[PDB]
Amino acid sequence: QEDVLAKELEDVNKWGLHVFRIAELSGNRPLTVIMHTIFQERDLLKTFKIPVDTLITYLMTLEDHYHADVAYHNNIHAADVVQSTHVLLSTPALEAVFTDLEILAAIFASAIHDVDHPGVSNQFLINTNSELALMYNDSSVLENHHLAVGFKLLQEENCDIFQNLTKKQRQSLRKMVIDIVLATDMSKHMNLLADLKTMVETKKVTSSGVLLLDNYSDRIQVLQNMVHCADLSNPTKPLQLYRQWTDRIMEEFFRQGDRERERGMEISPMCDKHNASVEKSQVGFIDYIVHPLWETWADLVHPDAQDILDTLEDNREWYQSTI
Amino acid sequence: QEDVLAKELEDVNKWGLHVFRIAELSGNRPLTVIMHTIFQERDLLKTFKIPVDTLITYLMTLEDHYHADVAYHNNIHAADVVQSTHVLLSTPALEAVFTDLEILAAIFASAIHDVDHPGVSNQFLINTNSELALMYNDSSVLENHHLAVGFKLLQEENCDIFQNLTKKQRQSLRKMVIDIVLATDMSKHMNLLADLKTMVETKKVTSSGVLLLDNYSDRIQVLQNMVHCADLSNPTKPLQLYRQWTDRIMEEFFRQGDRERERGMEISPMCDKHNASVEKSQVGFIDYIVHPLWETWADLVHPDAQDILDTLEDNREWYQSTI
Numbered sequence A, B: 001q002e003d004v005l006a007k008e009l010e011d012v013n014k015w016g017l018h019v020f021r022i023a024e025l026s027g028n029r030p031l032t033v034i035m036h037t038i039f040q041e042r043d044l045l046k047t048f049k050i051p052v053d054t055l056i057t058y059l060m061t062l063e064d065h066y067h068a069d070v071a072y073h074n075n076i077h078a079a080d081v082v083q084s085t086h087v088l089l090s091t092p093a094l095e096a097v098f099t100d101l102e103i104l105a106a107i108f109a110s111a112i113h114d115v116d117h118p119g120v121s122n123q124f125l126i127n128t129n130s131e132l133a134l135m136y137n138d139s140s141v142l143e144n145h146h147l148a149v150g151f152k153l154l155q156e157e158n159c160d161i162f163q164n165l166t167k168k169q170r171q172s173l174r175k176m177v178i179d180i181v182l183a184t185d186m187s188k189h190m191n192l193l194a195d196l197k198t199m200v201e202t203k204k205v206t207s208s209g210v211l212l213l214d215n216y217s218d219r220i221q222v223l224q225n226m227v228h229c230a231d232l233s234n235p236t237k238p239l240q241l242y243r244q245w246t247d248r249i250m251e252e253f254f255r256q257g258d259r260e261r262e263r264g265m266e267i268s269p270m271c272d273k274h275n276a277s278v279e280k281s282q283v284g285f286i287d288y289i290v291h292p293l294w295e296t297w298a299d300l301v302h303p304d305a306q307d308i309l310d311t312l313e314d315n316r317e318w319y320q321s322t323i
C-alpha cells in the first residue's frame, strides 16, 4: 500500500493527480502526505530549517481540524488546492519571479485556507445569527476563521514550523498568508478578477520573458488570484475528478438547503434538492465565474495554461451536452 | 444628588456637557443615564417599541463591560462620544438627511464603540501576538472586538433592545453599526477624511443650506465621519474638559509604554513618560489630525460647526502658549 502511495505521489507536479486515491492509500492523510512531498520537492525544509517531525506534527493537527463529515470542504479539498497551487507556481511565465518566502506563503495559505469549515456558507452563518458571524461582524466570516485556526495551531506542541524564520520573515509571511486567504471569499471574486484583467492589459515582461512584478501590490495580487484559481480549479481537471468534486459539493449544498427549508428560510440558490439542476448549474458557474477567471489567468501566463483552459472548455461542453 | 444630576442632564443638547460631574453624580453610570436621556429626548423608545426596563438592563450590562481601571477608554469616554454624536446629529445643515434607523445606528454605535477596551493600542496587540490579534488577523483588532461584544450583550437576559424591530430593520441597523464602528480605527482616518473632502467639493444643498444626500454610500460616509469626529472631539470641548481628557489619555498611553518597557519592546510614540511633551503633542495632534478633520466637517455643515471650530482653535492657541 505504501508502495502504491509513493508511486501516486510521483505525479505531484501534474495537473490531474489522483488525489482521491491518495486520500485512501494514505489512511485519510492526503493533506499531510501531499504537503510533505511538496516541501521536499521544493527543498523548503532545508531552506527554512523546518524540523521534519515539527512539519509532520503540524500537518497532522491541521488535517485533523478539517471536518471529516463534510462532503466537500474537507482535507481532500485542502490537499487538492495545495497541489494545484504548487503546479501553478511552477508555470514558465513565473520562473524566478517569487521568493522562497512567497512560495512558502502561497502553499501554506492553500493548506489552511478552508480549515474547520462547517459545510455551510457565509450567508447561511450570517442569516442564522451564528457565533462565527457574531465574532466576525458578518465580514469574510469563514475566511477570517480559517486564518485564525491555521495560525493558532502553530502554537500547539511541536507545531511551529516557522520557528527558524527571522522576525521580519515571520511578519512578512503572516501578512501575505492573510492577504491570500481573505481573497478566497467569493464576495471578493468580481473585484479580484477586474484587477487581474487590468494587470493582463498592462502587463510587463522581463528580458527573460517572465512577468515583471516590482511592488507588493502586484506580487500579492498574482498570488491571491493564483490561490483563488486553485480553489476554483475543479472544472479544469479531468472529467472523472471534476464529477467527483461536483457530487461532493452538491451533497454539501443540498444539506445546507435542507437546514434552510426546515428553518422556514428561503433556500439558497442551488441548495434545493427538489428543484436544482446540477448540469445547468455547472454550465452557468463555468460561463459566469470559472471560465472568465481561468481565461484571464491563461492570458497572464500565455500560453502556459492553454491545456488547462482546453480541459475546462471540454468539461463545459460535456455538461452542456447532458442538458 | 438625584436633583443635581437631573439639572446637569438638561444640557444634553449642548456641546460641553459636564460629563465628569454626571459620572460622579450617577454613581459611575454616565453611559446609562446619558443614553437613557437621549433615547427619551429623541422619542426612540416609542418609535422602536423598546421596553424601558430592557433598555436599562442592556445599558447597565454594556457599561459594566467598559473597564473601570482604564484611564481613558472607559464608560465616561463612551458616554461623551454618545452625547457628542447626539449633538452633531442635530446640526441644522443635516436636517432631514437621516432616517430614524440611521439615527439609532449612530447613537448605538457610539455607545458600544470602545466596549471592553484593554487600554492598549491595536499595534501593541499585534506586536505582542495577543489572542485578539490572532482572532482578527491583525485587522481593526479592537474595533472588531468592540462590535462583537456590543452585539453579543444583546443576547443576555432582558437585553434585546431591538426585539420589536422588523427583521429587515435589524439587518440594516447591524450593517450600519458595523460600518460606523469599524470607521473609528485611526488607521482609516486618512481615507475617511479624503472621502469627506470629496463630498464637500461636490455637495448639493437646498436654498436654505441643508445638505442633500441621496445615496446610502454618501450617508454612511457622513455617519462614519460624524462618529469619528465625536471620538476626536476632546480638543473641541471647553478647555477644562479637554485638559481632563488629556490627563486621562496620557496616563493610559504612559501605562502602555511602561508595559512595553518592561517587556523590552520599542516604546510607542507618545507613550514614553520619560521622553514625552504632552503639550507639544496636543498642538501636533490638532494641527495634523483634529483640525483638518473638523475644518472639513465645518465646511460640510457650513456654518453650523463654527462655535465648535472656534473652541478647537482657542484650545490650540492655549496649549501652544504653555510651550
Ligand SMILES: COc1ccc(CNc2nc(N(CCO)CCO)nc3c2ncn3C(C)C)cc1
Pocket (backbone or CB within 6 Å): A186, A231, A232, A246, A249, A250, A253, A269, A270, A271, A276, A277, A278, A281, A282, A285
Ligand atoms: C447543485 O450542485 C451544484 C454543484 C456545484 C455548483 C457550482 N460550483 C460552485 N458553486 C458555488 N456557488 C453556486 C454557484 O453560483 C456559490 C457562489 O459561488 N460556489 C462554489 C462552487 N465551487 C466552489 N465554490 C465556492 C465554495 C468557492 C453548483 C451547484
Ligand SMILES: COc1ccc(CNc2nc(N(CCO)CCO)nc3c2ncn3C(C)C)cc1
Pocket (backbone or CB within 6 Å): B186, B231, B232, B246, B249, B250, B253, B269, B270, B271, B276, B277, B278, B281, B282, B285
Ligand atoms: C502624551 O500624551 C498624549 C495625549 C494625547 C495625545 C493626542 N491625542 C491622541 N493621540 C493619538 N495618537 C497619538 C499620536 O497623535 C495615536 C493616533 O495618531 N490617538 C488618539 C488621541 N486621542 C484619541 N486617540 C485615538 C485613541 C482615537 C498625544 C499624547
Ligand SMILES: [Mg+2]
Pocket (backbone or CB within 6 Å): A113, A114, A142, A184, A185
Ligand atoms: Mg473557502
Ligand SMILES: [Mg+2]
Pocket (backbone or CB within 6 Å): B113, B114, B142, B184, B185
Ligand atoms: Mg476605539
Ligand SMILES: [Zn+2]
Pocket (backbone or CB within 6 Å): A077, A081, A113, A114, A184, A231
Ligand atoms: Zn476552498
Ligand SMILES: [Zn+2]
Pocket (backbone or CB within 6 Å): B077, B081, B113, B114, B231
Ligand atoms: Zn473612542
